Amino acid sequence: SGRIVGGVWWFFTLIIISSYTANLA
Amino acid sequence: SGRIVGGVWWFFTLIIISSYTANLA
């Protein structure tokens, strides 16, 4: 139950940090 | 106590490595 929360949050912050890196580039 | 240290340092190194990746890009 908490595992999928961790997974979804991880995917989310992944897309966000990748987006930040790309945009800053 | 150590939790916020790990968190802050994590955010720090995260933005720094993302910035490095972006600049090199």
Coordinates of N, CA and C in Angstrom, one line a residue:
Chain A
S1 N 0.8 -1.2 0.0 CA 0.0 0.0 0.0 C 0.9 1.3 0.0
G2 N 1.9 1.2 0.8 CA 2.9 2.3 0.8 C 3.9 2.2 -0.3
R3 N 4.1 1.0 -0.8 CA 5.0 0.7 -1.9 C 4.6 1.5 -3.1
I4 N 3.3 1.5 -3.5 CA 2.9 2.1 -4.7 C 2.9 3.6 -4.5
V5 N 2.8 4.1 -3.2 CA 2.9 5.5 -2.9 C 4.3 6.0 -3.2
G6 N 5.3 5.2 -2.7 CA 6.7 5.4 -3.0 C 7.0 5.4 -4.5
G7 N 6.4 4.4 -5.2 CA 6.7 4.3 -6.6 C 6.1 5.4 -7.4
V8 N 4.9 5.8 -7.2 CA 4.2 6.9 -7.9 C 5.0 8.2 -7.6
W9 N 5.3 8.5 -6.3 CA 6.1 9.7 -5.9 C 7.4 9.7 -6.6
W10 N 8.1 8.5 -6.7 CA 9.4 8.4 -7.3 C 9.3 8.8 -8.8
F11 N 8.3 8.2 -9.5 CA 8.1 8.5 -10.9 C 7.8 10.0 -11.1
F12 N 7.0 10.6 -10.2 CA 6.7 12.0 -10.3 C 7.9 12.9 -10.1
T13 N 8.7 12.7 -9.1 CA 9.9 13.5 -8.8 C 10.9 13.2 -9.9
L14 N 10.9 12.0 -10.5 CA 11.8 11.7 -11.6 C 11.5 12.5 -12.8
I15 N 10.2 12.6 -13.2 CA 9.8 13.4 -14.3 C 10.1 14.9 -14.1
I16 N 9.9 15.3 -12.8 CA 10.1 16.7 -12.5 C 11.6 17.1 -12.5
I17 N 12.5 16.2 -11.9 CA 13.9 16.6 -11.9 C 14.5 16.5 -13.4
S18 N 14.0 15.5 -14.1 CA 14.4 15.4 -15.5 C 14.0 16.6 -16.3
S19 N 12.8 17.1 -16.1 CA 12.2 18.3 -16.7 C 13.0 19.5 -16.4
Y20 N 13.4 19.6 -15.1 CA 14.2 20.7 -14.6 C 15.6 20.7 -15.3
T21 N 16.2 19.5 -15.3 CA 17.5 19.4 -16.0 C 17.5 19.8 -17.4
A22 N 16.5 19.3 -18.2 CA 16.3 19.6 -19.6 C 16.1 21.1 -19.8
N23 N 15.1 21.7 -19.1 CA 14.8 23.1 -19.2 C 16.0 24.0 -18.9
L24 N 16.7 23.7 -17.8 CA 17.9 24.4 -17.5 C 19.0 24.3 -18.6
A25 N 19.1 23.1 -19.2 CA 20.0 22.9 -20.3 C 19.6 23.8 -21.5
Chain B
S1 N 16.3 14.2 13.5 CA 17.4 15.2 13.5 C 18.2 15.0 12.2
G2 N 18.7 13.8 12.0 CA 19.5 13.5 10.8 C 18.7 13.4 9.6
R3 N 17.4 13.2 9.7 CA 16.5 13.1 8.6 C 16.5 14.4 7.7
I4 N 16.4 15.5 8.3 CA 16.4 16.8 7.6 C 17.8 17.1 7.0
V5 N 18.8 16.6 7.7 CA 20.2 16.8 7.2 C 20.3 16.0 5.9
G6 N 19.9 14.8 5.9 CA 20.0 13.9 4.7 C 19.1 14.5 3.6
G7 N 17.9 15.0 3.9 CA 17.0 15.6 3.0 C 17.6 16.8 2.3
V8 N 18.0 17.8 3.1 CA 18.6 19.0 2.6 C 19.8 18.8 1.7
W9 N 20.7 17.9 2.2 CA 21.9 17.6 1.5 C 21.5 16.9 0.1
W10 N 20.5 16.1 0.2 CA 20.0 15.4 -1.0 C 19.5 16.3 -2.0
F11 N 18.7 17.3 -1.6 CA 18.2 18.3 -2.5 C 19.3 19.2 -3.1
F12 N 20.3 19.5 -2.2 CA 21.5 20.2 -2.6 C 22.3 19.5 -3.7
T13 N 22.6 18.3 -3.5 CA 23.4 17.5 -4.5 C 22.6 17.2 -5.7
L14 N 21.2 17.2 -5.6 CA 20.3 16.9 -6.7 C 20.3 18.1 -7.7
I15 N 20.1 19.3 -7.1 CA 20.1 20.5 -7.9 C 21.5 20.7 -8.5
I16 N 22.5 20.4 -7.8 CA 23.9 20.6 -8.3 C 24.2 19.7 -9.5
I17 N 23.9 18.4 -9.3 CA 24.2 17.4 -10.4 C 23.3 17.7 -11.6
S18 N 22.1 18.2 -11.4 CA 21.2 18.5 -12.5 C 21.7 19.8 -13.2
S19 N 22.2 20.7 -12.4 CA 22.8 21.9 -13.0 C 24.1 21.6 -13.8
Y20 N 24.9 20.7 -13.3 CA 26.1 20.2 -14.0 C 25.7 19.6 -15.3
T21 N 24.7 18.7 -15.3 CA 24.2 18.0 -16.5 C 23.7 19.0 -17.5
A22 N 22.9 20.0 -17.1 CA 22.4 21.0 -17.9 C 23.5 21.9 -18.6
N23 N 24.4 22.3 -17.8 CA 25.5 23.2 -18.2 C 26.4 22.5 -19.3
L24 N 26.7 21.2 -18.9 CA 27.5 20.4 -19.9 C 26.7 20.2 -21.2
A25 N 25.4 20.0 -21.0 CA 24.5 19.9 -22.2 C 24.6 21.1 -23.1

